[PDB]
């Protein structure tokens, strides 16, 4: 197995205790991901800064104990704030994107470690299920979807382009619905907490892909001859399933070129650091939703024990399933309301 990546990152992770062959595979993963979801760039330095955010994120998912965003010490030989500044300085969402990424590192590492049985992760998983709109916002951060939209703009020196909160909500809902519709079978086999059709109706998965893809084509056509905005469309289009064919980390080849088959002290200290570590509104999502808002849904005391061939989070009750069904079934009108260019 031979790993391909630019030499700029070949001497990263100095004194990180992983074998050289594993660092090679991580660097390859970062480069492949970056080339797939930000396929164009003008700013090599920002591109490499993005690659390093993906390096850290891959290790956080693999061995959560290795990545502690709560500690002031270097992350994996990097200066996290420095890397984020190299990526985002002079761009409209720098401060919010640092919060987005640190949230992703906090939750991801907690999940890929012994902290998975902890109170932060327990409240996170409960808060995912409090409403379909909360789900899409939290899934966004978990997938770095708006982070990567922001990164795609930054990496093309588009330092003036930005979206409202509601616009990001719809753009990431498109990207995340597309990805999660395709990642469905993998996610179910692995006992995933963060998979859209663990919550949304299975009998609308195919239609959801089809509608998200069509609205993405309609947006693309409505943004024609502003080639700035193609970096946003391209992200959603290549992220939204196609990465399963392009990245060696997925199993397209292995499946024969087929697709388809209570101590609350740390938690309170982290809520206290919400402006630093949590995306805007997450502290309220965790405080309001962390114990489970609905008396009929099935919560668990902990989400650490890893289940298989079923989703590992909250099980929605009948009434919640219907509300989530109804939210999915008005996707087009929710999209058209924030992107009125779709009305025509």
Binding site for its own copies (CB under 8 A): 2, 4-8, 28, 31-32, 35-36, 39-42, 44, 181-182, 184, 205-206, 209-210, 213-214, 217-218, 220-221, 224-225, 227, 230, 233-234, 237-238, 241-242, 245-246, 248, 252-253, 256-260
3-class SS of residue 298: strand
Residue 294 touches which of its own copies, Zn ion, none (CB < 5 to 8 A by kind)?
Answer: Zn ion
Residue 298 forms beta bridges with which residues?
Answer: 315
Q: CB within 8 A of 115, min separation 6: which ones?
A: 64, 109, 121
Instruction: State the number of CA atoms in the 13 A half-sphere of 183 facing the CB.
Output: 24
Task: List the end-to-end C-alpha distance of the chain, in Å, as a whole number.
Answer: 50
Numbered residues of the known binding site for Mg(2+): 61, 190, 192
3-class SS of residue 249: coil
Residue 310 touches which of its own copies, Zn ion, none (CB < 5 to 8 A by kind)?
Answer: none
State the nearest-atom distance from the C-beta of 14 to its own copies, in Å. Answer: 21
Residue placing its CB nearer to Zn ion in the complex, 117 or 315: 315
State the nearest-atom distance from the C-beta of 136 to its own copies, in Å. Answer: 19
State the nearest-atom distance from the C-beta of 166 to its own copies, in Å. Answer: 22
State the nearest-atom distance from the C-beta of 231 to its own copies, in Å. Answer: 8
Residue placing its CB nearer to Zn ion in the complex, 229 or 317: 317
Binding residue for Zn ion (CB under 5 A) from 296, 326, 330, 341?
A: 296
d(CA 57, CA 252): 23
- CA distances, 119 to each of 9, 112, 299 (Å): 36, 15, 13
Residue placing its CB nearer to Zn ion in the complex, 115 or 123: 123
Residue placing its CB nearer to Zn ion in the complex, 158 or 294: 294
Residue placing its CB nearer to its own copies in the complex, 267 or 331: 331
Contact 311, 193 (CB under 8 A): yes
State the nearest-atom distance from the C-beta of 89 to its own copies, in Å. Answer: 20
d(CA 152, CA 83): 15
Contact 176, 251 (CB under 8 A): no
Return the DSSP state at 78: B
Does position 16 bind Zn ion by CB under 5 A?
Answer: no
Compose the 311-330 pattern: x for residues touching Zn ion by CB under 5 A, - for all others. Answer: ------x--x----------
Per CB under 5 A, which region of 82-90, 99-107, 135-143, 293-301 contacts Zn ion?
293-301
State the nearest-atom distance from the C-beta of 234 to its own copies, in Å. Answer: 5
Residue 78 forms beta bridges with which residues?
Answer: 75
d(CA 197, CA 202): 6
Residue 302 touches which of its own copies, Zn ion, none (CB < 5 to 8 A by kind)?
Answer: none
Total residues binding Zn ion (CB under 5 A): 5
Return the DSSP state at 17: S
57 closest CA partner among 119, 143, 136: 143
Residue placing its CB nearer to its own copies in the complex, 21 or 295: 21
**Other C-beta atoms within 10 Å of 264: how many?**
14
Query: Residues in the site for Zn ion, rule: CB under 5 A?
Result: 294, 296-297, 317, 320
């Amino acid at each position: 197995m031979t790993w391909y990546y630019p030499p700029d990152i070949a001497s990263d992770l100095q004194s990180v205790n992983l074998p050289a062959e594993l660092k090679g595979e991580i660097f390859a993963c970062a480069w492949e991901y970056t080339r797939c979801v930000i396929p164009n760039y003008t700013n090599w330095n920002r591109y490499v800064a993005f690659m390093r955010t993906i390096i850290i994120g891959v290790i956080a998912e693999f061995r959560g104990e290795m990545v502690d965003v709560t500690a002031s010490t270097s992350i994996l030989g990097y200066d996290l704030d420095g890397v984020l500044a190299a990526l985002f300085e002079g761009t409209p969402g720098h401060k919010e994107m640092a919060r987005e990424y640190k949230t992703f590192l906090l939750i991801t590492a907690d999940k890929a470690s012994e902290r998975r049985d902890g109170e932060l992760f327990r409240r996170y998983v409960n808060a995912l299920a409090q409403s379909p709109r909360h789900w899409f916002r939290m899934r966004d951060c978990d997938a770095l979807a708006r982070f990567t939209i922001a990164s795609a703009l930054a990496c093309n020196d588009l330092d003036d382009i930005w979206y409202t909160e509601e616009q990001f909500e719809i753009l990431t809902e498109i990207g995340d619905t597309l990805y999660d519709a395709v990642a469905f079978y993998k996610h179910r086999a692995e006992g995933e907490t963060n998979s859209t059709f663990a919550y949304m109706p299975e009998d609308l998965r195919i239609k959801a892909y089809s509608e998200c893809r069509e609205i993405l084509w309609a947006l693309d056509a409505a943004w024609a001859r502003n080639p700035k905005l193609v970096n946003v469309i391209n992200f959603l289009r290549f992220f939204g399933g196609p990465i399963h064919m392009m990245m060696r980390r997925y199993r397209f080849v292995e499946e024969n070129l087929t697709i388809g088959k209570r101590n609350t002290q740390r938690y309170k200290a982290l809520i206290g650091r919400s402006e630093e570590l949590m995306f805007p509104g997450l502290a309220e999502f965790l405080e309001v939703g962390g114990d489970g808002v609905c008396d009929k849904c099935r919560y668990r005391e902990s989400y650490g024990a890893e289940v298989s061939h079923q989703f590992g989070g909250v099980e929605l009750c009948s009434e919640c399933k219907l509300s989530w069904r109804q939210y999915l079934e008005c996707f087009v009108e929710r999209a058209a309301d924030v992107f009125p260019e779709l009305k025509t």
